[PDB]
Amino acid sequence: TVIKNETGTISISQLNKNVWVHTELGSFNGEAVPSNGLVLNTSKGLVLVDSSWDDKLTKELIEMVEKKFQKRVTDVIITHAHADRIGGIKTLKERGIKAHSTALTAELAKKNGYEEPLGDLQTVTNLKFGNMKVETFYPGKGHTEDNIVVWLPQYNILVGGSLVKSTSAKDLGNVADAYVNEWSTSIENVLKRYRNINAVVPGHGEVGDKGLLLHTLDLLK
Ligand SMILES: [Zn+2]
């Protein structure tokens, strides 16, 4: 289930047959800062939900999964325009890895000096990679104005991203780019759209269930 790398900075934990969570530790702020993403093992190659803090980590992550699953990373879904999500955009672009995002995430990325992801995702976009079905959903502003969630309909698995706080998060964290008055409605939009969720992957911390969305709503009070 769990697989680390050279230094411990990169680890992958299996949720299921074709779905794994990737977690990388940062260096700026706290003393570690562990971000989560997903690795989708499809029949057409590997698909990642979010990159990492920087190019160095993004390269390692890619090389780790490509060697392990014996297929190439073909696409990446960027959940918002913050560093730990879009930091390795330069690596993805130069290797020919498709970087999907909403037009708003792309716009913000460019404004902040990062290379632009595709800006192809709408409010609701349905993608399919080989066998793997993936739906992206913009539920409104919250953690950032552009944050989106990712849903795997075949597993009822929701990648909540930074819009969703783990049980360990006792506060909202970085709210510099957040919309605390709209974040609750956005969370409600997710709950209304996905009434039956098996697992919820937060932007950082332990995987949980619908309870993390409820936990986030409480943190917003
Ligand atoms: Zn963020």
* Domain map (residue ranges) of the chain: 1-221
Q: Which residues of 27-59 are buried (b: 16+ CB within 10 A; e: fewer)?
A: eeeeeeebbbbbbbbbeebbbbbbbbbbbebbb
CA of 84 to the centre of ligand 1 (A): 7
Please identify which of the residues 18, 22, 36, 84 carries the catalytic annotation: 84
Whole-number Å distance between alpha carbons of 148 and 133: 17
Distances (CA, A) of 118 to 52, 77, 176: 17, 10, 25
Name the residue type at position 154: Q
Residue 96 CA to ligand 1 centre (angstroms)? 25
Solving technique for this entry?
A: X-ray
Name the CATH architecture for the domain at 1-221: 4-Layer Sandwich (3.60)
Active site residue 82: yes
* Known active-site residue 18: no
In the reported structure, the alpha carbon of residue 142 is separated from the centroid of ligand 1 by a whole-number distance in angstroms of: 10
Resolution of the PDB structure in angstroms:
1.9
CA–CA distance, 108 with 12 (Å, rounded to integer):
29
